[model samples]
Target: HHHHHHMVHITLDRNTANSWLIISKDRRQVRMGDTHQNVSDNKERFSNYPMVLGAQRFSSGKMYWEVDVTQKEAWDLGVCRDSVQRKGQFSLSPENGFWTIWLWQDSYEAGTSPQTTLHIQVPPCQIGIFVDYEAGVVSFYNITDHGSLIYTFSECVFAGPLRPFFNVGFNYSGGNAAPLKLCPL
Candidate 1:
């Protein structure tokens, strides 16, 4: 897929952003916050998880976007069915309607059925996600590493629309305070 015309500009959905998450005023980036901030009481917002969704939903064709995760120590990036639950804790797996991958400290793990472990010497600071909705495929690329392929989850049971997903994990001693910045185009 060398066409390179699938890139899409994504913005954070304020209604779905976690209560404790700080989204840039312009809605292009998100970062973890220590305490929940006052916002509209919306069911779409995550109740406990520090996550946010892309305002746009996709149901067909291919879409691509990049995220700058520089200095991030713990984070999750992927996509989920538009109706996936966001009110409580659940495994970040397909069974729960989420298809995601995360990095905790130095270990990389994907939300494959079995949670595959990713191995790499130098982790990429920028990640590119490509999703082919009809093909039921979601691929993650290491943009800072010459666009090398990092992982791909295929044969996914996609239903309804899908939303781009992200999570800036707990700010352990402020070590994971880096923003999960969307590279606005």
Candidate 2:
């Protein structure tokens, strides 16, 4: 059997960034800003949602990317459909077009309908997202420990091109003021 694994370079879509979310100059890093910027609102902008989308989209193939979440206390990282609702409070679950895992208060959880809590022995400083679009699987790994399997979302239905999604929660304190870095794979 031949296993093909390749890395994908992804950058944050600034246009889709939330008002309080700050994007780095190179667009591969994002974090919660201390204050909300007075910028004009647009349809692509996420108002109440503190999230951003990837500049590239994929419908099929095996792709992987890593994120540096060392300083974050709360964050959500996953793959979302291109047509996922960008406004209002939407459920971040597969039923709602998102297949994601979240880290909150040092605990891990899956963004499922009922929300599944994960029992991870180690805190994840770096996270790896692996997507097998054709196989309908999305998996997360704790890259901080040599890529240990963290969680996996199986039987995903790709309605459209899925984009890398990220969000640093609104608990923006000095300690949690860490930018989520999209590592070069």
Candidate 3:
């Protein structure tokens, strides 16, 4: 019954950040920048969006991590294959190598092939991401509501390592500019 026993600590990776994003020195938070800053190029970087990957990489394990999404009106939280597209804009989906859920326009939905609209009875302030690598399952939980399951993707195929995916979505210029704050272990 102990679901959090597989919890893993995660930090942001500057190398994986897009040029228009700013990552805290401690690498625990990420936010959008007013302009794309000049920076060294990395193979794992995002070229056209405000997104970042986690410092920790997982291959096979039962793991959990949470993010503080309080007051953020727009954002994307999920996991992506190590080799997921890093260049251009692509549809968000497990088929696209991303298992994510989005919060936009005060509504929530899972980023599946045919995205699922979530009728969240209570808005979640903190999101919990759970993954069972060997079992091919990736689930999101509403940590603010006693760890209730928000959504899950089954039959996932991890061709490579997986990284915690974070994105400060479009129109984050003002009300939605909050960083995707990673919760402490």
Candidate 4:
């Protein structure tokens, strides 16, 4: 059809019970499927938080763009070695325990990193994360405060792309309450 196309359509919503989140999105360029696989894996197992999840895929050589995700309490993004695997979590904790974006890999304890590296704090509020693969950066923002800058980090890149299957997640650590909708972009 067309070249240089980037269309990422997404739909996300919190259940009325506030215990589960449902997400549906089609994130892919026409060129990616040849060597890359698009993925939207949901992490339903409770490993410390309640949540919904999503992701896209590229080869170990093709460059990655970015995916924007909205964050809330009791929510997280599940990372893994592949579409069918679960790496770890990027949880939303309070101050020290409420929200955290773990870059967990290598070892169980070695894959986690605090979400404060952007020199910002994503409290129990609506925030957005932009993961830039080409630049090898991960950034956070406060969506409520007019997309205010929360922080930025250069250490969040996937070392060996094929070895680490990546995705966007929302692990709810905010108790048993649902906050809002989490649609993809």
Candidate 5:
């Protein structure tokens, strides 16, 4: 039988919203990756960073994900967004059982420089990522790379009470957003 589930509502404001990020209590920032094409002053309204939700702790259950992002910034497993910000690696629980989620591009440079020559595209046009924390894996798929494990943060152990926080940040020149929703398991 299909399990009955409740979904937390999260909306996107085109005017001032441009990014969706999540930050954990341990200072891990997991935000939506963007690109130079997304860099525009069309709206003239910009925020340093979007609003982030509190830490989200999901017990053993299923998670449904969905997002509508700008094409300029909405690329799959490819780096051409946000100037390819230094290979983009966010360290989580660096002390013990630490893991890193790193992104690279075809034209990637070494240290300080991020590759941005490549672009990621997907069919049906939707940005959704299903992360099975219990399985120690994150899955982002499209028509091209279906079920492709874009990046993996291995060697990390998940302890109980893992609260997930929503973290949003943007530059003054351009706006960004990071909206997230979480329900009980």
Candidate 6:
């Protein structure tokens, strides 16, 4: 096996960020924000899902990015089709255009066709996502462990361009305020 480093600089798009979440001025970090911001209920903003999309979208080739979730209690990160639903409670399944890995209660899981529980020895301080669009592969790595393979979704069918997606949970109430910072290459 070979190690491929295809890091890409990405930041959350505030237009697509949920009202309860805040995207940093640099847009490299996202965290739980004031829950009562009185933000608009725009169609592009996520309503039921507390998440945001990346400023860039990829239609081909392999792209990689990482998230520093060290101090957070829970988070979800990965790539999703550009058409992913932004206004309602939806499945975190690949069939619904999402392929992600999450950490909750220090436990890990992958958002596959049938969500899979990952048995990682330790909570990942940083998580890596590597997507090979043409090959139909979405792989996750535990960057804290020198990029150990955590899980991979193979044979993925990408009906459209894929964009980086992230979520900090709907009811996050300042308990997990540690920002999920996007790491640079």
Cα lDDT of model 1 by residue, 28-144, tens digit:
989887887888778888888898899999999999998999998899999998999878778899988888889986899999777899866668898889999888999988877
Best by TM-score: 1
Shift of residue 181 alpha carbon in model 6, Å: 0.3
TM-scores, each model vs. reference: 0.95, 0.93, 0.94, 0.42, 0.38, 0.93
Pairs clashing within candidate 6: none
Off by over 4 Å in 1: 1-3
lDDT of 5 by residue, 1-185 (tens): 11123232333223232333333333322344454325444331223333322224455544434432332211222111111112224322323222222222222111112321323443323333444556654333332344333333333244433222222334333443332323222
Cα deviation of 133 in candidate 1 (Å)? 1.0
For model 3, residues 39-135, the per-residue Cα lDDT tens digits are 9888888888788999888999799988998888898999999889999879888778899999988789999879899878889999999999999
Tens-digit lDDT track for model 2 on 1-185? Answer: 01225788898988888989889899988888778876777898777868999999998789988899996888899999998888888789898899999987668899998999987887888898999999999999887777888888988887889999998877745567788999876
User: Candidate 4's error at 109, in angstroms?
Assistant: 16
RMSD of each: 1.3, 2.0, 1.5, 11.7, 11.4, 1.7
Question: Which sections of candidate 3 miss by over 4 Å?
Answer: none
What lDDT score goes with residue 44 in model 3?
A: 80
Model 5 C-alpha lDDT versus the unseen true structure: 0.31
What lDDT would candidate 1 get against the real structure? 0.87
State which candidate, 4 or 6, has the greater lDDT. 6
Residue-level lDDT of model 6, residues 31-109, one tens digit each, is: 7765645677678888876798999999999888888887787889999999988876787888899999887776888
Cα deviation of 142, candidate 3, in Å: 0.7
